[PDB]
Amino acid sequence: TPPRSPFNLVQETLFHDPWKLLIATIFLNRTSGKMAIPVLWKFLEKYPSAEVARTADWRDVSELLKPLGLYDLRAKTIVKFSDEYLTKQWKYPIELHGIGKYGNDSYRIFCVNEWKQVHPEAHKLNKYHDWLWENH
DNA sequence: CCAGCGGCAG
DNA sequence: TGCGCGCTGG
C-alpha cells in the first residue's frame, strides 16, 4: 500500500482499482489536471468499471469529455482500452490500447510493488519516485 | 476577447 | 500525422 506523501497525485486515491488509475492517466494526457480531475469524477460516476465502460457508446463518452479536448480520440480509446483490460491477457498495462509509459509507470509504482524498476518521466511522478528512493 | 501549449494509434 | 480544449499569461 503506497505511503502518505506530500504529493497531490490522483493515483494515490485510485490505486486499488487499476482500471480507474489507468483511466485517470488517459484523462491527464495533454490536459490540465485542473480540468481532467472534476471530469474524471463525472465519468467514474457514470462508468464506474471497465465492465460497463467497454459496452459504452463512445459518442456518449465523447460528449462528456468535450471541455478536455481530444474527446473523440479519448472516448474511442477508453471503450477499446476497457474491453482489452478485461479480455486481453496482460501483465503490464502498456500491452493495452491507449496505455503508454505514463500509465505503465503509474501502474508499476502504485498498483504493483515495482517502483524500483520504474524510470518515470512525468514531472510529478518523477518527483514522487525520487521521494520513494530518498525515503527507502 | 488574444493564442501557444500539451504521446497514443493508425 | 491527427487529435483539441480552455488555461494561462499578461
Domain boundaries, chain A: 1-136
Between the alpha carbon of residue A9 and those of residues A15, A19, A23, A42, the distances in Å are: 11, 16, 14, 18
Q: How far is the CA of A73 from the C1' of B9 (A)?
A: 9
Distances (CA, A) of A96 to A10, A67, A85, A93, A106: 21, 25, 7, 5, 14
Q: Report if CB A101 to strand B is under 7 Å.
A: yes
Alpha-carbon span A125 to A83, nearest angstrom: 27
Query: Which amino acid type is present at position A66?
Result: K
What residue is closest to B9 (Cα–C1')?
A98
- Kindly determine whether the C-beta of residue A100 is less than 7 Å away from any atom of nucleic acid strand B: yes
In this structure, what C-alpha cell is assigned to residue A116?
524500483
CATH topology of domain A1-136: Endonuclease III; domain 1 (1.10.340)
Resolution in units of Å: 2.1
CA atom of A128 to C1′ atom of B10, Å: 34
Task: Determine how many CB atoms are found less than 10 A away from the CB of residue A90.
Answer: 12
Residues A39 and A92: their CA atoms lie apart, in Å, by 26
Q: Please report, for residues A29, A104, A128, the alpha-carbon distance to residue A118 in angstroms, rounded to integers and kept in the order given.
A: 19, 9, 12
Distance from residue A71's CA to nucleotide C2's C1', rounded to whole Å: 13
- Which technique? X-ray
Q: Phi, psi (5° rounding) for residue A50? A: -65, -35
Q: How far is CA A100 from the centre of its chain?
A: 10
Residue A63: all three cell numbers together? 460528449
Say which residues have a Cβ less than 8 Å from residue A116's Cβ, sequence separation at least 6. Answer: none
Footprint of strand C on the protein (CB under 7 A): A 30-32, 34-35, 66-74
Closest CA to A50 of A78, A27, A26: A78
